[PDB]
Amino acid sequence: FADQYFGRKLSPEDVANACEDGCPEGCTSFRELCQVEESAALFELVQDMQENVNMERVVFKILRRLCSILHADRCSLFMYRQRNGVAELATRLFSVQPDSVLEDCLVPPDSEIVFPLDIGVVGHVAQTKKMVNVQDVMECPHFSSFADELTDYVTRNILATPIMNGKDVVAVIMAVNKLDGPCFTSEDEDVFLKYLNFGTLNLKIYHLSYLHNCETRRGQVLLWSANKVFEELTDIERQFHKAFYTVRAYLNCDRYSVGLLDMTKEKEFFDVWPVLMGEAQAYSGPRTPDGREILFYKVIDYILHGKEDIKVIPSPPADHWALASGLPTYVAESGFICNIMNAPADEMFNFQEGPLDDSGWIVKNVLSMPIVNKKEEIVGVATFYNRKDGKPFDEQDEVLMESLTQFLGWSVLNTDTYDKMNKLENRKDIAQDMVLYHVRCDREEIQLILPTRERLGKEPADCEEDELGKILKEVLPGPAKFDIYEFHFSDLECTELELVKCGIQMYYELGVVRKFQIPQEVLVRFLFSVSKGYRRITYHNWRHGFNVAQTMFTLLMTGKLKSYYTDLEAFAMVTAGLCHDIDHRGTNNLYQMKSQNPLAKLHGSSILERHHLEFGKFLLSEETLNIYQNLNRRQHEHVIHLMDIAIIATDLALYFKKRTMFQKIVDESKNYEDRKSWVEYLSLETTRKEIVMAMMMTACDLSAITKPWEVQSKVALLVAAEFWEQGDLERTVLDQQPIPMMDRNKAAELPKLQVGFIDFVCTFVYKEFSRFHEEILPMFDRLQNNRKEWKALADEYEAKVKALEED
Amino acid sequence: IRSATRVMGGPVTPRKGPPKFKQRQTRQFKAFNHLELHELAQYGII
Amino acid sequence: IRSATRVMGGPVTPRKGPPKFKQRQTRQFKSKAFNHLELHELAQYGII
Amino acid sequence: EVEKFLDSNVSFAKQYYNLRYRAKVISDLLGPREAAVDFSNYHALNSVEESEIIFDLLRDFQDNLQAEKCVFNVMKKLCFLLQADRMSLFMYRARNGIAELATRLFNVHKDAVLEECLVAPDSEIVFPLDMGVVGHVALSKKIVNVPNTEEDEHFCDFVDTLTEYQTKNILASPIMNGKDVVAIIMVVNKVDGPHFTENDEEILLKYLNFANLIMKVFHLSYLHNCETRRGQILLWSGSKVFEELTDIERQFHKALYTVRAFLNCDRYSVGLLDMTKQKEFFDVWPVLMGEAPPYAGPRTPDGREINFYKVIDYILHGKEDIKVIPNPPPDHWALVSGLPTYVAQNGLICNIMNAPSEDFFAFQKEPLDESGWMIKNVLSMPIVNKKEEIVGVATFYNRKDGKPFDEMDETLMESLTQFLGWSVLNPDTYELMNKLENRKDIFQDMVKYHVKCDNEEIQTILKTREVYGKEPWECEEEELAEILQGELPDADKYEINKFHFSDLPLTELELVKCGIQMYYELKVVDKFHIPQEALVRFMYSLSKGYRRITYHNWRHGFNVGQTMFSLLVTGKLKRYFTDLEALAMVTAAFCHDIDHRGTNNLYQMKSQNPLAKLHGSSILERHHLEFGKTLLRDESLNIFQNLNRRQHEHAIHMMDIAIIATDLALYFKKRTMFQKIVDQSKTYETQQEWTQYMMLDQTRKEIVMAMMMTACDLSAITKPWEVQSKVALLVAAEFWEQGDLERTVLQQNPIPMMDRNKADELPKLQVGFIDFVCTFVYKEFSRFHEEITPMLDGITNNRKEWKALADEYETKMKGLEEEK
Ligand SMILES: Nc1nc2c(ncn2[C@@H]2O[C@@H]3COP(=O)(O)O[C@H]3[C@H]2O)c(=O)[nH]1
Ligand SMILES: Nc1nc2c(ncn2[C@@H]2O[C@@H]3COP(=O)(O)O[C@H]3[C@H]2O)c(=O)[nH]1
Ligand SMILES: [Mg+2]
Ligand SMILES: [Mg+2]
Ligand SMILES: [Zn+2]
Ligand SMILES: [Zn+2]
């Protein structure tokens, strides 16, 4: 056995046979004979890993012939993973030798020998991420013997390096012996760093594929959760159940259950009497960190092995298969992402050692995390009980499930908004019921209009229309005593009770009660209710609304404006003009913007005109107060459309913008010589009739300026009083300076304001309609008369101030 | 045991002490047409 | 600069035609207690 | 010497040379040494240098990979092994659902530098998939060889004449990552042969293994990065959309601004459309009349005008700049191109690779920014709010890398605009809540006005209009006391502080005056300085708050209030309760049944009334609690104005205790917790001073409060017969009305008392109520206080006189049965 001399024998002999070793392929010497065999073996290994990556099967072959080059007794791969913040190095391939099959060295998932961060050189290398060579293992300060006593093995010479993918260590491979050498001659260290360099290329491929799959799963689950969170607003239970059931093939679990925590924070006044009343001993168990009580009131568990068997527990007992472990009640005690290696071999939590069902189900890996709702408040605990792959939970699964639970916990604003919206809707319904009761006229006060308990013995509801009409024919006034067929219908003469009867009578004049077969009781009750609807403010009260209705009825009947419209379109107007000022608070539209009233926020433009419409439609929506019940759907929709064009059109702001079209229509009325054919022309057009109707909407509410001066003076005084009230109410609540007509101390300069109002806002609807129809000239003539009277008063005051200036 | 490398049941670790759980991540995510519009402004309209 | 391809500016396609654009994908998601001697005593009255 | 025959004979020295020099034979090969394969000679046939060239191929697998140099070296060597020149690596990408095939390494031959064999994405030829042998390889997914290209099918010569080349022969073979193509290597011509031989295919396949799995690493890394970024964008947006609940504009701005980094794009901008579908009624007349000619421009598929009322743009290539341009002009740099309006019209995911060659849209051709930045790559897609109607258009401009958007990049923000469209549920819910709350406030104001004592009827009681001459809210407090003395009835004469009091003779308005007086008799108005005008207004408004129903009208509330007032002043129960506590109890008893519909809680549960759906338990009591405080919360009608914060927080807190506790169900559950207190009261022997312990203790006081609420609500039994009979008739009528309402509305048979035809059984079902519900509280108080003894006499006498009728009916029934 030579020592050093035979150095020029091996290679220089150049195998002087040309066929030695049995078969060459063109080799020259020994150095050229190892090269070709190594290249062929490495190429075969590369071809093995070409497709359908098989990490273990090929790393085993790589380590099989790497040991021999190093003379190492055994070679072993140590996989690396992370759990709940601390890394862990599992034992995947162990004791690989040149004379071993794959199954002899592979370690199944239920046979790992995991090492922590620091214990042993296997962990010191992971912390260092560098090579370590230990000549004798007794000398190094850090070295574990836990892998010595089980294996019945003794180690005396180690050589380990970690497999790194950038900055993240993937695994560590360590030769455990040297055999024919005491201290791992450094010549072997370089080749070990190099021969294992292209074997690292496959470990990182496997790691990259695993990470890609995990992140694809996370993206899919997040997208599905976002899909089904936004479907609709639902309570917490249904939303969470939907979002959890919808994504169950991506979690790769077998069983997982979601527990819900009761959110009763503060007990109610009588709940806590007994506790300090010498009974009902107070709670003493664990508490949620925020200070609440831990009480799972609903647990939904999903089973994915065998059959879905999805079931809900409405009040789980203490011996539930999920809550009995004591882990779900511990995540509620403090917010931690609990992760367990071996559930059966645990002391803190009492996991059942035996099976649970005939299928033989034993829990091995558990992962529980809380559901925080963006307020650091624990809302529930979701626990996953195993993996389909069979391997214990890794860090990627932890990140995936943490992301899912974090998104779901963030998705509690939807349920909170659902509850708030339900409460607000219920409160609005209650308020509407109150208003309806306080506006509708009761049975004991409807007898003023039609007395049926005196004439008959029956309640008003328990009567026939033919018999009901007999009372009306007598109580209702005639068409001549109150002359509702005139343009100078004085209002202050009659009491507020007579106006309801006048309204009913003019509803009878149109011939509409019997045309659409509406019920008389409902009509009377609706008139009384709408009369009660108006407030008691100075001017805009029931009197003004009924005056508008009567003026428009006079326009239709004695103004010959009824020819264009049918009887149905006249039913929808006398009703719309009668309730157009139904809930007026005195303040005009401009005030709602400056006072930040809720009316301004609800409605953009025409704050108060658009608000009377909704109240008016609400009043005639419920039965026993609805006079449109018998109308079919088409007629009812047409009437709704007519009212919604009518009530809003009474606004003066919309009057100014949209007067030119009415002027054009009136001008176009002059090229038709036969006014009996203009009726035919205009009785078919829709938009033209709508414009004319919206114009007569505001040509009648601006009335009381065309009435005899005796009535006009009092009406003007009432209007000025209302404006002064608004102005006085404006310099204290808003602390501003009212406009001159709203100054109570500016009352002397009233007539000039009146003449300015007449010549600017008025005298256009009253001139175009006079030109359109000569039938409606008297209102224009009286308007001019009142204008001249107010100008005379203005000149009188001008003379007074002039005398003050030149006395 | 012969089948596995002297280990059965579940995995075994050379650690004895109190388990430490994750602390949870709380910081990663956190004018209409007019000659002179104001002629009618002196009244209630606008 | 050799440029290898001997072309500069922007990518060059052999065929020219009116742009064709992808359709939206919707084939996956939008596939659409009292302590008592006996309780009926209260039930006789408005209670419970 | 030389007779070492073991070495001489074969197969021994091999296993020693291994053990010794095998590491150094391997160590140098894998180092940095260059290949020892001669390339000048052409038909080498690679006898033993085949292994040397294999080691060089494995020499670049170290962990420093860019997937460009290694593949280029592999192709350099393959040009020598294949006996062919000018290889080319045609990359594979897909846009708009149609695949492309763009060159990455072009004109690669042996002895060439990488700088002159790499093509930048700026100038790269991009062939389609459906023509040429490149497309044939991409579709067939197998190696093909086509000698004499001029006589084979599907061969395109667009780049043959562009690069002034010939390409006599072609050999191409794809590389695939699990059924998915990633690239295609091409070979043109054979240097010293007529066409590629069969063995050349095998050589290429055998030497392509190294390059097949090195491109897979880069492809997987790119896919992993894309998936990670997609996961991040969907998780950084949930946080900013769930922080609060705001309108669409700000929510979209936040979600888009927080995920700027992951979307590695130089610029992007999002435009929002006007969502109104129907014009207003007064905005339609001019079009029909003839003015304002109608719209004839582009429209969305669902039939809406395409108007961008706000276009938010984000700039990142130079200096960060996020700005908003409300009502942007049509010539906005993001809107000059017709892409946004075209996407609005159609709704497709438009992807454009080049602006200079664009024809349909005609993008800008000048650098927009001061520094050279020209729009080249554009990706625009719409946003639909779950019903296939476009909400806006988002356009993403040049990437930070330089390559055109591909499918893995398109699916990145294609899943983000899906998220934005799905998130619209929150902006929608934002406006509904505001509108609904405004309607609730409006209707609450309506009802508040309806139940309120205005200036016309306030003078009915407090009349300063004629005897003084001015409205009440200007009179002085001392000047306001005189007008009440001559109007408020005297307590002594009117019998308002004794248990036997009947309000039948008194008028409806008289009870309001009695209630106003009852506050003075407690000497509580003066010490708390509460305004008298506000007190009068509140007392009068309480009358209007109550309904006009048969029994639970204002009269019952006043009777309960008077019962409490008597229990305090003549019952000597004031000792335990503080003066402020009396102020709270009297007012809580006055409005304990304010706004009573007329049906009990069971009908609320049965009929699904809106009250039931809001209050879990004791629906009517909680409803009356939340309505009696609303009237007390506003100025000019509140009586707690001159109370400091701790007294105010105390007084309101015990209104909940009293008003809620009047429920009968809540009474029976905790009936036996007051008897223990009563027993504790009789154990403090040698004095009558058990009061002093009561005063501090409190919880005892609260239970007594909850127990004297139940002793006042059902106080109708205690009145003399001449009033108890009438009250019993009224309550029976109310129950009959409830039964009639329940029979028809819900279609079920009521309990016996609510049935009309069981009227004759009223006395016998009334004695049962008196013996079961009553005669326990009124016995416990009687045994607990001797000053309230007359209440049990009035219960015993009333039951005695009820048994008369209960037995008269029994005799009648017995006689009628005997007739049978
Ligand atoms: N290959 C191999 N390694 C072993 C064997 N026994 C122990 N080891 C390793 O040798 C290491 C010596 O200390 P380590 O941290 O403590 O952990 C030990 C294991 O990684 C064995 O039989 N084969
Ligand atoms: N100059 C050059 N052209 C090539 C190379 N490889 C392929 N081509 C061209 O690219 C074209 C792609 O398909 P064509 O019909 O098949 O014919 C091909 C050649 O014209 C190469 O290495 N250099
Ligand atoms: Mg009005
Ligand atoms: Mg009650
Ligand atoms: Zn009006
Ligand atoms: Zn009551």
| Residue-range domain boundaries for chain A | 30-211, 215-420, 445-800
* Residue whose CA is at the smallest distance from ligand 2 atom 20: D160
A146 CA to centre of ligand 1 in angstroms: 9
Task: Give residue D283's domain range.
Answer: 227-433
C→D interface, C-beta within 8 Å: 2-15, 18-26, 29-30, 34, 41-48
Q: What are phi and psi of A74, to 5 degrees?
A: -135, 155
- CA-CA distances (angstroms) from residue D366 to D371, D374, D621? 11, 6, 75
> Which of D115, D123, D415 is most worth mutating to test chain C (most C CB atoms within 10 A of its CB)?
D123
CB contact under 8 A, D352 and C42: no
Whether D149 and D271 share a structural domain:
no
Instruction: Return the ligand number nearest the Cα of D553.
Output: 6
CB contact under 8 A, A392 and B22: no
A42 and A199 Cβ atoms separated by less than 8 Å: no
- Greatest C-alpha distance within chain C: 104
Closest partner CB to A417 (pick from D231, D429, D676): D429
The span from the CA of A301 to the CA of A321, in Å, is 10
E strand or H helix at A297: strand A296-303
Topology given in CATH for the domain delimited by A215-420: Beta-Lactamase (3.30.450)
CB contact under 8 A, A398 and B14: no
Q: Measured at the alpha carbon of residue D694, what is the angle toward residues D693 and D697, in degrees to the nearest 5?
A: 85
Number of helices and strands in chain D (H, E): 34, 12
Q: What are phi and psi of D521, to 5 degrees?
A: -60, -20
Question: Which residues on chain B are in Cβ contact (under 8 Å) with A108?
Answer: 4
Which residue from C29, B29, B28, A371 is spatially nearest to D242, judged by alpha carbons? Answer: B29
CB contact under 8 A, B30 and D236: no
Which residue from B1, B2, B4, B16 is spatially nearest to A110, judged by alpha carbons? Answer: B4
Give D47's contacts (C-beta < 8 A, 6+ positions apart).
A25, A26
D76 and D60 Cβ atoms separated by less than 8 Å: no
Compute the count of residue pairs across chains C and D with CB atoms less than 8 Å apart: 115
What six digits make up the tokens of A238?
């249904």
Closest partner CB to D26 (pick from A32, A38, A437): A38
Whether D146 and D271 share a structural domain:
no
Domain boundary among D195, D224, D253: D224
Question: Which residues on chain B are in Cβ contact (under 8 Å) with A107?
Answer: 4-5
A451 and A471 Cβ atoms separated by less than 8 Å: yes
**Is D673 an interface residue toward A (CB < 8 Å)?**
yes
The span from the CA of D224 to the CA of A208, in Å, is 7
Whether D212 and D238 share a structural domain:
no
CATH code for the domain in which residue D505 is found: 1.10.1300.10
* Residue whose CA is at the smallest distance from ligand 1 atom 20: A122
B→D interface, C-beta within 8 Å: 29-30
Q: Are strands D170-177 and A168-175 parallel, antiparallel or unpaired?
A: unpaired
**Which ligand 2 atom minimizes the distance to the CA of D108?**
22
Q: What are phi and psi of A53, to 5 degrees?
A: -45, 125
Whether D244 and D258 share a structural domain:
yes
The span from the CA of D658 to the CA of D221, in Å, is 71
Q: Are strands D308-315 and D267-273 parallel, antiparallel or unpaired?
A: antiparallel
- Residue A442 DSSP one-character state: P
Helix (H, G, I), strand (E, B) or coil at A172: strand
Residue D5: inside a domain: no
CATH class of A30-211: alpha beta
Mutate to test the pocket of ligand 2, among D71, D85, D88, D92 (most ligand atoms within 8 A of CB): D88
Residue D312: inside a domain: yes
What six digits make up the tokens of A472?
């009306």
Provide the shortest C-alpha distance from residue A761 to chain B (in Å): 9
Residues of the binding site of A for a divalent metal cation: 544, 580-581, 701
Whether D203 and D233 share a structural domain:
no
Same fold? A30-211, A215-420? yes
Give A647's contacts (C-beta < 8 A, 6+ positions apart).
A576, A579, A580, A609, A610, A612, A613, A616, A697
Residue D816: inside a domain: no
- CA-CA distances (angstroms) from residue D266 to A11, D206, D357? 63, 43, 20
The span from the CA of A734 to the CA of A721, in Å, is 19
Which residue from D740, D805, D718 is spatially nearest to D498, judged by alpha carbons? Answer: D718
Residue-wise DSSP of A499-539: HHHHHHHHHHHTT-TTTTT--HHHHHHHHHHHHHHS---SS
Question: Which residues on chain D are in Cβ contact (under 8 Å) with B30?
Answer: 239
Positions of A marked catalytic: 540
Residue D443: inside a domain: no
Residue D807: inside a domain: yes
- CA-CA distances (angstroms) from residue A593 to A101, A432, A587? 88, 25, 11
Q: Measured at the alpha carbon of residue D662, what is the angle toward residues D656 and D666, in degrees to the nearest 5?
A: 95
Which is the catalytic residue, given D253, D552, D596, D624?
A: D552
Provide the shortest C-alpha distance from residue B40 to chain A (in Å): 8
Residue D154 annotated in active site: no
The span from the CA of A256 to the CA of A247, in Å, is 12
Whether D195 and D112 share a structural domain:
yes
Residue-wise DSSP of A89-137: B---EEEE-TT--HHHHB--GGG-B-B-SSSSHHHHHHHHTS-EEES-T
Whether D63 and D89 share a structural domain:
yes
- Greatest C-alpha distance within chain A: 152
CB contact under 8 A, D54 and A277: no
Residue-wise DSSP of D414-481: HHHHHHHHHTTHHHHHHHHHHHHHHHHHHHHHHHHHHSS--HHHHTTTS--TTTTSS-GGGS-HHHHH
Q: List chains adjacent to chain D, taking adjacency as at least 3 C-beta pairs closer than 8 Å.
A: A, B, C
> Which of B1, B2, B5 is most worth mutating to test chain A (most A CB atoms within 10 A of its CB)?
B5
What six digits make up the tokens of A208?
């990259």
* Residue whose CA is at the smallest distance from ligand 1 atom 6: A147
Helix (H, G, I), strand (E, B) or coil at D722: helix
Which residue on chain B is closest to A363 by alpha carbon? B10
- Reported in sequence order, the residue ranges of chain B that DSSP labels E, i.e. its strands, are none
Whether D24 and D108 share a structural domain:
yes
Whether D394 and D410 share a structural domain:
yes
**Ligand 1 pocket, Cβ-based, cut-off 6 angstroms:** A 74-76, 95, 115, 120-122, 143-144, 147, 151, 153, 155, 158, 174, 176
CB contact under 8 A, C47 and D352: no
Distance of CA A695 to the CA centre of its chain: 43
- Partner residues linked to A75 by β-bridges: A96, A175
**Is A119 an interface residue toward B (CB < 8 Å)?**
yes
The span from the CA of D423 to the CA of D430, in Å, is 12
Which string of b and e fits A126-153 if b means at least 16 CB within 10 Å? beeeeebbbeebeeeeebeeebeeebee
A435 and D450 Cβ atoms separated by less than 8 Å: yes
Domain boundary among D224, D244, D273: D224
Q: Which of residues 399-428 of A touch B (CB under 8 A)?
A: 402, 406
Instruction: Return the ligand number nearest the Cα of A609.
Output: 3
Question: Which residues on chain D are in Cβ contact (under 8 Å) with C34?
Answer: 668-669
E strand or H helix at A298: strand A296-303
Whether D627 and D757 share a structural domain:
yes
Question: Which residues on chain C are in Cβ contact (under 8 Å) with D354?
Answer: 10-11
For residue A173, the one-letter residue type is I
D728 CA to centre of ligand 1 in angstroms: 95
The span from the CA of A215 to the CA of A250, in Å, is 11
D557 CA to centre of ligand 4 in angstroms: 9
Quick one: resolution in A? 3.4
A737 and A670 Cβ atoms separated by less than 8 Å: no
CATH code for the domain in which residue D147 is found: 3.30.450.40
- Residue D293 DSSP one-character state: P
Q: Which ranges constitute the DSSP H helices of D747-789?
A: 762-772, 777-784
Contact yes or no, C with B (3+ CB pairs under 8 Å): no
CB contact under 8 A, B10 and A740: no
Percent of chain C that is helix, strand, coil (3-state, to 5):
10, 0, 90
Q: Which ranges constitute the DSSP H helices of D264-322?
A: 285-289
Whether D468 and D519 share a structural domain:
yes
A580 CA to centre of ligand 5 in angstroms: 6
- CB of residue D87 inside a 6 A radius of ligand 2: yes
Which residue on chain D is closest to C30 by alpha carbon? D386
Domain boundary among D224, D246, D276: D224
A106 and B5 Cβ atoms separated by less than 8 Å: no
- CB of residue D167 inside a 6 A radius of ligand 2: yes
Residues of the binding site of D for a divalent metal cation: 556, 592-593, 713
Topology given in CATH for the domain delimited by A445-800: Catalytic domain of cyclic nucleotide phosphodiesterase 4b2b (1.10.1300)
Question: Which residues on chain D are in Cβ contact (under 8 Å) with C22?
Answer: 96-97, 348-349, 351, 410
E strand or H helix at D661: helix D645-661
Residue D652: inside a domain: yes
- Number of folded domains that form chain D: 3
Dihedral sign computed on CA atoms, order A673, A677, A679, A681: negative
Whether D152 and D89 share a structural domain:
yes
Which residue from D497, D595, D504 is spatially nearest to D542, judged by alpha carbons? Answer: D595
Q: Would you tell me the crossing angle of helices D215-241 and D407-422 to the nearest 10 degrees?
A: 10
Give D743's contacts (C-beta < 8 A, 6+ positions apart).
D749, D750
CB contact under 8 A, D48 and A428: no
